[PDB]
């Protein structure tokens, strides 16, 4: 029985995880107190993917909460679903990292990593057949990035055969909230490229653009961003929980999407999104979902796919629909946009179909792309990195905690090598 251990780090990861546990909990029908009050018989069939079973017919999510500032933990406990989590999994300390990756990875997090790994081992030992992990955190921050990278390294050291997923929120061109985001982002990306099987890219700029242009909201908050992201996470792993005409495990996505080991940075997307005003106009059907999934403005990474090529894509549909229509639409998308797909991967579109849609919708779809345009994002960070590293803008904070220029240099070189490895396949006309 496949099931997932869940880890949350930092403020962004903690909040996204809280919202995610509210969404999954609806689909499966779980009371905030922990009891089950569903209506369908298929909600409890595979509930063990996320939830352990307690004595009194309760269900406890298999989540791990990590931070160095206690305050966020309180915000989780004093909330709509604060009592659902078991208190033993609230692992935290004091004197947070303060947006310093060195404190998160080397000085402060090195003490709390033992306790976090203890709780992770305790959860993973009880697993019937542990599939893999998934971590939510922010690369541009402090405790989140550092402790996420450290935990990822330790877990890959101890569990080499299991899947290691990751949902990362990285910096943006215009949206910036810390002065030292490039250093943290560069070091985090250097750590992630080695020790991770899948990494979904999320950008606040793309989510705000979706909210303003697609959903037409006027005053979006972080709740809406968490809503979209949690919808994506629930969309990714639908097939482990519910039956379908053609299933798609996590390993199937990993195999079909990753041509070479270092190219595992994905662009996610979700459909439909209708703004609550145009819901009565559009007809809902497979062609509409196909059109919305591949639209450039619907992506969550703020990287235009038209500036590169799609190495691979995966489409996970939820709902009762015909397979012939899905296959025809995917073939049409391949054929019409002939110049945005690579010429040495015939039929580079993975397809999955699940028969149980979300509770309020007749149809839905999730899109996981893998394209060269992601290089742009890395290039941007690299540019900013140089602009601070050449003069050593803030390096004394990092070197005071037990680092040196050599780690910065090797991280920058690794990032540049990854950026070069994407471009290779980016240009057309492989001959000269």
């Amino acid at each position: 029985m496949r099931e997932i251990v869940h880890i949350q780090a930092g403020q962004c990861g903690n909040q996204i995880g809280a919202k995610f546990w509210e969404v999954i909990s609806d689909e499966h029908g779980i009371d905030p107190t922990g009891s089950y009050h569903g209506d369908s018989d298929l909600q409890l069939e595979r509930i063990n993917v996320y939830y352990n079973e307690a004595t009194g017919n309760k269900y406890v999510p298999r989540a791990i909460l990590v931070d160095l500032e206690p305050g966020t933990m309180d915000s989780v406990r004093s909330g709509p679903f604060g009592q659902i989590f078991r208190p033993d999994n609230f692992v935290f300390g004091q004197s947070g990292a303060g947006n310093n990756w060195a404190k998160g990875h080397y000085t402060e997090g090195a003490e709390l990593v033992d306790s976090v790994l203890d709780v992770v081992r305790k959860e993973s030992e009880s697993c019937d057949c542990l599939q893999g992990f998934q971590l939510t955190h922010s690369l541009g921050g402090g405790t989140g990035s550092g402790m996420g990278t450290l935990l990822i390294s330790k877990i890959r050291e101890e569990y080499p055969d299991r899947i290691m997923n990751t949902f990362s929120v990285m910096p943006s061109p215009k949206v910036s909230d810390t002065v030292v985001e490039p250093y943290n982002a560069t070091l985090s990306v250097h750590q992630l490229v080695e020790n991770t099987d899948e990494t979904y890219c999320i950008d606040n700029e793309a989510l705000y653009d979706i909210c303003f242009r697609t959903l037409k909201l006027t005053t979006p908050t972080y709740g809406d961003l968490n809503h979209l992201v949690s919808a994506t996470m629930s969309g990714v792993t639908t097939c482990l929980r519910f039956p379908g005409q053609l299933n798609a495990d996590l390993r199937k996505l990993a195999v079909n999407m990753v041509p070479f080991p270092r190219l595992h940075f994905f662009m996610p997307g979700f459909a439909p999104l209708t703004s609550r005003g145009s819901q009565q106009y559009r007809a809902l059907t497979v062609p509409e979902l196909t059109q919305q999934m591949f639209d450039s403005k619907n992506m969550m990474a703020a990287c235009d796919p038209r500036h590169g090529r799609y190495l691979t894509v995966a489409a996970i549909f939820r709902g009762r629909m015909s397979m012939k229509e899905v296959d025809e639409q995917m073939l049409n998308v391949q054929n019409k946009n002939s110049s945005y797909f690579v010429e040495w991967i015939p039929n580079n579109v993975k397809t999955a179909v699940c028969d149980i849609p979300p509770r309020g919708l007749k149809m839905s779809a999730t899109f996981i792309g893998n394209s060269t345009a992601i290089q742009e994002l890395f290039k941007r960070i690299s540019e900013q990195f140089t602009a601070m590293f050449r003069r050593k803008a803030f390096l004394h904070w990092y070197t005071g905690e037990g680092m040196d220029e050599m780690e910065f240099t090797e991280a920058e070189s690794n990032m540049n090598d990854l950026v070069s490895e994407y471009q290779q396949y980016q240009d057309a006309t492989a001959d000269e």
């Binding site: 070479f260 080991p261 270092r262 050599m406 070189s413 070069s420 490895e421 000269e432």
Partner: protein
């Protein structure tokens, strides 16, 4: 300088003698012929290499190559290159249970010793013989293994931890916290070699009773100094001698692996597959820019896909002179595998390195400017303007 290529064929073992023992490998001059056992009507496909070696029969003289023969032909040449001040490497290749341990290490108790002992003994003899009042020599040793994408040190005492691979900005990849031991005599480095060979991870399989389970890299750092109180520069030359023994590719059906022995093999195959790509990639690039026009626009070599290719970034290409020793199996049943090695060997000679090797760039600039001054002064003197 192009990569040097040696190939060698071994005699029959017990597995070959029990099954069909039909030979397919023939050798003549520099030419190695392989014949398809399934298609005798087909062409006898053949490859021309820099060196080929026939170790099937010892009494006869049909180009028979003892250990000393291959050692003179490759290792002595590459050691002479090292004395001139060039970083140098010899690495083995082929399939499981062919010739790597015999060729590089050999049987210590027997006279048929591998390349590494004979290179080390000749190096020690040459440094001891050529010692002078002004000349002086120093040598240092290290020996590492790659087990499952993890580096371990053999010469050091028991260290359960795994070392960390790092990147110096100028000198490229290296292994941090690697026990680099100073040595002074042939007996001491021989003891280090024996301890290192003992410390390696070896397991038994159907294909070979002593199938290696981990890649191995043996590094010797050599320093050549010339002392003068007036003009000469001390530490005139520094060289790195790298002997690499790679675990060969395996097939699960014939190997009979299960459990851990299977998983190890999988990693080994991964560490080989990437390596093959790198070789192929490298070849095409150093074939293309050299022959096509000279464009040098951009070519990516997947060095980082494995730790083995990462550590040997300067060895497979760049700042070193490299030799590749391929091990063959004469068994007919092995044909579909054996030919594969030859193909990569046939591409191995296409690779071309770029080695110059200097030291103390301040002294480099000073020497360049002083030589320019001397040349201009000589020109002025010859033409009557000095």
């Amino acid at each position: 300088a192009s990569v040097k290529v040696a190939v060698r064929v071994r005699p029959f073992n017990s597995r070959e003698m029990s099954r069909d023992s039909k030979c397919i490998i023939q050798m003549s001059g520099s030419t190695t012929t392989i014949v398809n056992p399934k298609q005798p009507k087909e062409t006898p496909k053949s490859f021309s290499f820099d060196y080929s070696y026939w170790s099937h029969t010892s009494p006869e003289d049909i180009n028979y190559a003892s250990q000393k023969q291959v050692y003179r032909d490759i290792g002595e040449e590459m050691l002479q290159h090292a004395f001139e001040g060039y970083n140098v490497c010899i690495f083995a290749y082929g399939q499981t249970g062919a010739g790597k341990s015999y060729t590089m290490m050999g049987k210590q108790e027997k006279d048929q010793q591998g390349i590494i002992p004979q290179l080390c003994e000749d190096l020690f003899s040459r440094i001891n013989d050529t010692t002078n009042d002004n000349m002086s020599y120093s040598v240092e040793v290290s020996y590492m293994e790659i087990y499952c994408e993890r580096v371990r040190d053999l010469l050091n005492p028991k260290n359960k931890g795994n070392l960390r691979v790092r990147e110096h900005p100028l000198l490229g990849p290296y292994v941090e916290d690697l026990s680099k031991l100073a040595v002074t005599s042939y007996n001491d480095i021989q003891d280090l070699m024996d301890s290192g060979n003992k410390a390696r991870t070896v397991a038994a399989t159907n294909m070979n009773e002593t199938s290696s389970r981990s890649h191995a890299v043996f590094n010797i750092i050599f320093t050549q100094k010339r002392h003068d109180a007036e003009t000469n520069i001390t530490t005139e030359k520094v060289s790195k001698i790298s002997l690499v023994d790679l675990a060969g590719s395996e097939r699960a059906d014939s190997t009979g692996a299960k459990g851990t022995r299977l998983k190890e093999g999988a990693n080994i195959n991964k560490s080989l597959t990437t390596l093959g790509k790198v070789i192929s990639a490298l070849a095409e690039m150093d074939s293309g820019p050299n022959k096509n026009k000279k464009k040098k626009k951009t070519d990516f070599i997947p060095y980082r896909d494995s730790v083995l290719t990462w550590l040997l970034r300067e060895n497979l290409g760049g700042n070193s002179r490299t030799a590749m020793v391929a091990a063959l199996s004469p068994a007919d049943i092995n044909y579909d595998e054996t030919l594969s090695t030859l193909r990569y060997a046939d591409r191995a000679k296409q690779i071309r390195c770029n080695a110059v090797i200097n030291e103390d760039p301040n002294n480099k600039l000073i020497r360049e400017l002083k030589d320019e001054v001397t040349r201009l002064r000589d020109l002025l003197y010859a033409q009557g303007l000095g």
